[PDB]
Amino acid sequence: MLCDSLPTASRTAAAILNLAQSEDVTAEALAQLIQTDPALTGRILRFANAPAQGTRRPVASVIDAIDLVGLPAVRQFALSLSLIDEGRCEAFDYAAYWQKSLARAVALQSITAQAVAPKEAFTLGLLADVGRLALATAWPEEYSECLRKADGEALIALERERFATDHDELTRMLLTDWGFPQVFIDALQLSQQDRTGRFARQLTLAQHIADHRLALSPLLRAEARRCGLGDEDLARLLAD
Numbered sequence: 001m002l003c004d005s006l007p008t009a010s011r012t013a014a015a016i017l018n019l020a021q022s023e024d025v026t027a028e029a030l031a032q033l034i035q036t037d038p039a040l041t042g043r044i045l046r047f048a049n050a051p052a053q054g055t056r057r058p059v060a061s062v063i064d065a066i067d068l069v070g071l072p073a074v075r076q077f078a079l080s081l082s083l084i085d086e087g088r089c090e091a092f093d094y095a096a097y098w099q100k101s102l103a104r105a106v107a108l109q110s111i112t113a114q115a116v117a118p119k120e121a122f123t124l125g126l127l128a129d130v131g132r133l134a135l136a137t138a139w140p141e142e143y144s145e146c147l148r149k150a151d152g153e154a155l156i157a158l159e160r161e162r163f164a165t166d167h168d169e170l171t172r173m174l175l176t177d178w179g180f181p182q183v184f185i186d187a188l189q190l191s192q193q194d195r196t197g198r199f200a201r202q203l204t205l206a207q208h209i210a211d212h213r214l215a216l217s218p219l220l221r222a223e224a225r226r227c228g229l230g231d232e233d234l235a236r237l238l239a240d
């Protein structure tokens with residue numbers, strides 16, 4: 001349904017709410033949890049960046065946003081999680097989405113730690129396909145129809161046909177609305193189709209690591225090397 005907030009996983013919303021309810025809550029402890037959730041991460045960043053309107057460099061990590069807007073503000077984002085009624089889109093594999101998203105973020109953080117700010121690349125990774133969550137949330141029944149029929153490139157075309165947008169473009173407009181740095185958005189768009197170029201490549205790697213962790217290939221072995229990584233980094237990235 002339109003104007004419905006992106007949802008958070010149940011257990012995770014429970015943790016975040018309880019944590020925040022305490023008066024002895026820390027920013028580090030709140031950030032650790034929040035940053036595993038695309039929805040909350042997106043609301044906070046929009047909250048921290050939108051007011052600025054471009055008057056300064058944007059935050060691109062939760063911890064950075066917490067310290068900017070203050071911990072009492074962020075408690076409140078936690079305190080209302082309850083309201084967001086782990087979603088009605090029947091065909092959408094929410095758990096898979098949440099796992100893949102987190103693994104991609106962890107991977108991309110590792111990758112850039114040895115090659116752009118890791119904490120921020122973590123965030124881009126996490127949110128790199130948030131347009132899927134948004135479709136499932138705005139139009140559950142319609143999106144189910146789509147997911148049940150198509151997949152991959154057909155899916156994008158079917159989404160375009162049914163919603164006058166796709167999940168890749170949604171991701172990008174959301175990230176732009178949330179004040180993400182232009183370079184991240186370009187990198188993402190680039191990666192959505194085989195400097196900005198380097199990062200786009202690390203993102204696709206991260207996505208690929210993610211794909212495989214939720215399931216050592218030839219090309220992926222070479223992708224590792226295109227990024228200047230090589231081993232055993234690539235292995236470490238596939239083992240917890």
Ligand code: NA
Binds near residue numbers: 085
């Ligand atoms: Na409801």
